[PDB]
Amino acid sequence: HMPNLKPIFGIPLADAVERTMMYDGIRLPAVFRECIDYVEKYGMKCEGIYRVSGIKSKVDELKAAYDREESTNLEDYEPNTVASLLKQYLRDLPENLLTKELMPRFEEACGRTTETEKVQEFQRLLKELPECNYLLISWLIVHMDHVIAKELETKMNIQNISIVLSPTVQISNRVLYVFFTHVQELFGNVVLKQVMKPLRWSNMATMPTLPETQAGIKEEIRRQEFLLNCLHRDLQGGIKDLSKEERLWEVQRILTALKRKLREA
């Protein structure tokens, strides 16, 4: 029969999206957000950010865990590791972000005599792209742009990211440099929406393992309630899945603790 039961590393974007839908299902895989989320929250002041090699021994476990639909607490892993898992994940995806179709035109648009001519070409390229690709290209480049500012503190430069991001989407070095530069020239309101992440807690038995900080609970509750109300509502669309339900009590149980501690801090 078909090899393996639902893979993850080596599928089209939508296929990955439908598999890894977390919040609203804004047409985007979870993996990408999970990795962008960690870097945005914790991996912002990391030297070697996206530059150092991730521990392949951890990465191969992660890709396995995702492919097996398991629990991956990236908040306990190294930034280089998740970043390496991410860039690999993007590689494994058959359809490029810019596809085979538009990809060769990025070389063209990079060799434009004027910054305006470049962005215009990239503009038409990105429009050809599917919705999922459009959003993927937005976040990947915009998030890495903010990483360039972080490079300004982590003692790195656009060139460094460009070197390591080239093998990522399969496009020449100079195109990444121009990618960010033009990415805000094209977008700029593009926002890096972070996600509620699994805890190091096994979600039962214990209790004194939760964040005891007020601002910590405030932010998390906000993020979690949006996850909560949406998932609950999903079921009302004629959906009766035990897996969705299990996660429904899951979010509720955790938020219950948070709601208590909210007025407990």
C-alpha positions as semicolon CSV with decimal commas, in nm:
position;residue;x (nm);y (nm);z (nm)
1;H;0,000;0,000;0,000
2;M;0,101;0,366;0,028
3;P;0,427;0,403;0,224
4;N;0,389;0,551;0,574
5;L;0,074;0,683;0,739
6;K;0,057;1,059;0,681
7;P;0,405;1,210;0,632
8;I;0,500;1,575;0,685
9;F;0,845;1,634;0,538
10;G;0,784;1,606;0,166
11;I;0,433;1,725;0,084
12;P;0,264;2,024;-0,089
13;L;0,186;2,331;0,121
14;A;-0,194;2,288;0,138
15;D;-0,148;1,919;0,224
16;A;0,082;2,025;0,509
17;V;-0,162;2,302;0,603
18;E;-0,465;2,075;0,634
19;R;-0,249;1,841;0,839
20;T;-0,093;2,102;1,068
21;M;-0,382;2,347;1,114
22;M;-0,348;2,509;1,457
23;Y;-0,537;2,836;1,513
24;D;-0,764;2,949;1,233
25;G;-0,608;2,770;0,942
26;I;-0,475;3,081;0,767
27;R;-0,328;2,851;0,497
28;L;0,013;2,786;0,647
29;P;0,187;2,483;0,806
30;A;0,235;2,470;1,184
31;V;0,603;2,381;1,165
32;F;0,690;2,713;1,003
33;R;0,503;2,906;1,271
34;E;0,637;2,692;1,554
35;C;0,991;2,771;1,441
36;I;0,924;3,138;1,366
37;D;0,753;3,166;1,705
38;Y;1,048;3,029;1,902
39;V;1,298;3,253;1,724
40;E;1,073;3,556;1,767
41;K;1,031;3,495;2,140
42;Y;1,362;3,349;2,252
43;G;1,598;3,319;1,956
44;M;1,621;3,690;1,886
45;K;1,944;3,764;2,073
46;C;2,111;3,441;1,964
47;E;2,453;3,475;1,803
48;G;2,492;3,235;1,512
49;I;2,115;3,271;1,471
50;Y;2,025;3,072;1,156
51;R;2,399;3,064;1,090
52;V;2,530;2,785;1,311
53;S;2,447;2,427;1,220
54;G;2,163;2,267;1,411
55;I;2,235;1,943;1,594
56;K;2,137;1,694;1,322
57;S;2,079;1,436;1,593
58;K;1,802;1,654;1,739
59;V;1,674;1,769;1,401
60;D;1,624;1,415;1,270
61;E;1,427;1,341;1,586
62;L;1,213;1,652;1,537
63;K;1,138;1,577;1,171
64;A;1,051;1,227;1,286
65;A;0,829;1,360;1,565
66;Y;0,644;1,593;1,329
67;D;0,611;1,317;1,067
68;R;0,468;1,089;1,338
69;E;0,234;1,365;1,461
70;E;0,388;1,387;1,809
71;S;0,445;1,655;2,071
72;T;0,743;1,879;2,004
73;N;0,841;2,129;2,270
74;L;1,069;2,355;2,067
75;E;1,100;2,589;2,362
76;D;1,339;2,337;2,512
77;Y;1,553;2,299;2,198
78;E;1,827;2,515;2,049
79;P;1,741;2,795;1,798
80;N;1,988;2,667;1,537
81;T;1,823;2,328;1,573
82;V;1,464;2,441;1,503
83;A;1,587;2,678;1,231
84;S;1,766;2,387;1,065
85;L;1,459;2,171;1,096
86;L;1,258;2,453;0,942
87;K;1,488;2,523;0,646
88;Q;1,503;2,150;0,585
89;Y;1,125;2,119;0,606
90;L;1,095;2,389;0,339
91;R;1,342;2,205;0,121
92;D;1,152;1,876;0,152
93;L;0,841;2,048;0,022
94;P;0,808;1,953;-0,350
95;E;0,655;2,280;-0,467
96;N;0,888;2,575;-0,417
97;L;0,762;2,896;-0,265
98;L;0,843;3,079;-0,586
99;T;0,781;2,751;-0,772
100;K;1,002;2,635;-1,060
101;E;0,796;2,877;-1,267
102;L;0,879;3,210;-1,098
103;M;1,212;3,112;-0,935
104;P;1,431;3,184;-1,248
105;R;1,279;3,532;-1,274
106;F;1,418;3,623;-0,933
107;E;1,764;3,610;-1,088
108;E;1,629;3,847;-1,353
109;A;1,469;4,084;-1,101
110;C;1,791;4,083;-0,901
111;G;1,978;4,211;-1,203
112;R;1,756;4,515;-1,245
113;T;1,924;4,851;-1,295
114;T;1,690;5,014;-1,042
115;E;1,540;4,912;-0,706
116;T;1,200;4,995;-0,851
117;E;1,242;4,758;-1,146
118;K;1,337;4,481;-0,907
119;V;1,041;4,509;-0,673
120;Q;0,802;4,534;-0,970
121;E;0,927;4,201;-1,111
122;F;0,912;4,031;-0,770
123;Q;0,563;4,177;-0,736
124;R;0,431;3,991;-1,040
125;L;0,621;3,679;-0,933
126;L;0,458;3,669;-0,589
127;K;0,113;3,723;-0,746
128;E;0,150;3,407;-0,953
129;L;0,225;3,217;-0,630
130;P;-0,063;3,040;-0,449
131;E;-0,206;3,193;-0,130
132;C;-0,005;2,961;0,097
133;N;0,316;3,049;-0,088
134;Y;0,232;3,417;-0,073
135;L;0,197;3,399;0,306
136;L;0,499;3,170;0,346
137;I;0,725;3,402;0,144
138;S;0,590;3,696;0,343
139;W;0,673;3,557;0,686
140;L;0,996;3,379;0,602
141;I;1,155;3,688;0,452
142;V;0,997;3,948;0,683
143;H;1,083;3,746;0,994
144;M;1,439;3,702;0,875
145;D;1,453;4,076;0,806
146;H;1,383;4,141;1,172
147;V;1,658;3,886;1,235
148;I;1,893;4,118;1,041
149;A;1,829;4,386;1,303
150;K;1,899;4,114;1,555
151;E;2,220;4,049;1,362
152;L;2,298;4,412;1,433
153;E;2,310;4,317;1,801
154;T;2,416;3,946;1,762
155;K;2,712;4,076;1,561
156;M;2,604;3,942;1,223
157;N;2,498;4,087;0,888
158;I;2,248;4,047;0,602
159;Q;2,522;3,863;0,412
160;N;2,535;3,586;0,675
161;I;2,164;3,514;0,660
162;S;2,179;3,541;0,280
163;I;2,444;3,266;0,271
164;V;2,247;3,026;0,486
165;L;1,908;3,120;0,344
166;S;2,021;3,063;-0,016
167;P;2,030;2,677;0,030
168;T;1,698;2,718;0,210
169;V;1,464;2,821;-0,078
170;Q;1,711;2,733;-0,357
171;I;1,792;3,085;-0,477
172;S;2,126;3,269;-0,518
173;N;2,282;3,457;-0,224
174;R;2,227;3,809;-0,356
175;V;1,857;3,736;-0,400
176;L;1,811;3,692;-0,024
177;Y;1,975;4,025;0,054
178;V;1,738;4,181;-0,201
179;F;1,458;3,958;-0,069
180;F;1,445;4,144;0,263
181;T;1,519;4,488;0,123
182;H;1,237;4,439;-0,131
183;V;1,017;4,240;0,110
184;Q;0,934;4,552;0,309
185;E;0,930;4,751;-0,014
186;L;0,649;4,512;-0,113
187;F;0,486;4,433;0,222
188;G;0,571;4,569;0,566
189;N;0,248;4,531;0,758
190;V;0,318;4,160;0,737
191;V;0,311;4,049;1,096
192;L;0,475;3,750;1,264
193;K;0,181;3,592;1,445
194;Q;0,322;3,375;1,723
195;V;0,158;3,054;1,841
196;M;0,066;2,895;2,173
197;K;0,330;2,626;2,231
198;P;0,317;2,294;2,424
199;L;0,472;2,298;2,771
200;R;0,745;2,081;2,920
201;W;0,463;1,963;3,147
202;S;0,290;1,637;3,054
203;N;-0,038;1,825;3,112
204;M;-0,154;1,618;3,410
205;A;-0,070;1,491;3,762
206;T;0,142;1,792;3,853
207;M;0,036;2,153;3,914
208;P;0,329;2,368;4,050
209;T;0,491;2,390;3,707
210;L;0,287;2,672;3,557
211;P;0,406;3,034;3,505
212;E;0,349;3,225;3,829
213;T;0,400;3,563;3,665
214;Q;0,105;3,796;3,601
215;A;0,225;3,936;3,268
216;G;0,315;3,583;3,166
217;I;-0,036;3,458;3,226
218;K;-0,203;3,765;3,070
219;E;-0,025;3,718;2,738
220;E;-0,064;3,340;2,734
221;I;-0,435;3,350;2,818
222;R;-0,493;3,589;2,526
223;R;-0,312;3,356;2,287
224;Q;-0,469;3,044;2,431
225;E;-0,830;3,171;2,441
226;F;-0,811;3,247;2,069
227;L;-0,691;2,892;2,017
228;L;-0,962;2,774;2,254
229;N;-1,268;2,953;2,116
230;C;-1,175;2,872;1,756
231;L;-1,118;2,499;1,810
232;H;-1,439;2,468;2,009
233;R;-1,629;2,650;1,734
234;D;-1,477;2,422;1,469
235;L;-1,677;2,127;1,603
236;Q;-2,002;2,313;1,540
237;G;-1,933;2,293;1,168
238;G;-2,068;1,939;1,167
239;I;-1,745;1,798;1,303
240;K;-1,728;1,511;1,549
241;D;-1,364;1,409;1,586
242;L;-1,232;1,264;1,909
243;S;-0,885;1,402;1,841
244;K;-1,024;1,754;1,812
245;E;-1,228;1,699;2,129
246;E;-0,931;1,567;2,330
247;R;-0,741;1,884;2,239
248;L;-1,051;2,084;2,331
249;W;-1,050;1,962;2,694
250;E;-0,675;2,001;2,671
251;V;-0,681;2,377;2,612
252;Q;-0,965;2,423;2,862
253;R;-0,784;2,233;3,140
254;I;-0,471;2,442;3,092
255;L;-0,661;2,769;3,069
256;T;-0,855;2,670;3,381
257;A;-0,529;2,669;3,576
258;L;-0,431;2,998;3,411
259;K;-0,769;3,158;3,487
260;R;-0,723;3,066;3,853
261;K;-0,364;3,193;3,868
262;L;-0,476;3,504;3,675
263;R;-0,647;3,626;3,991
264;E;-0,388;3,444;4,198
265;A;-0,094;3,661;4,096
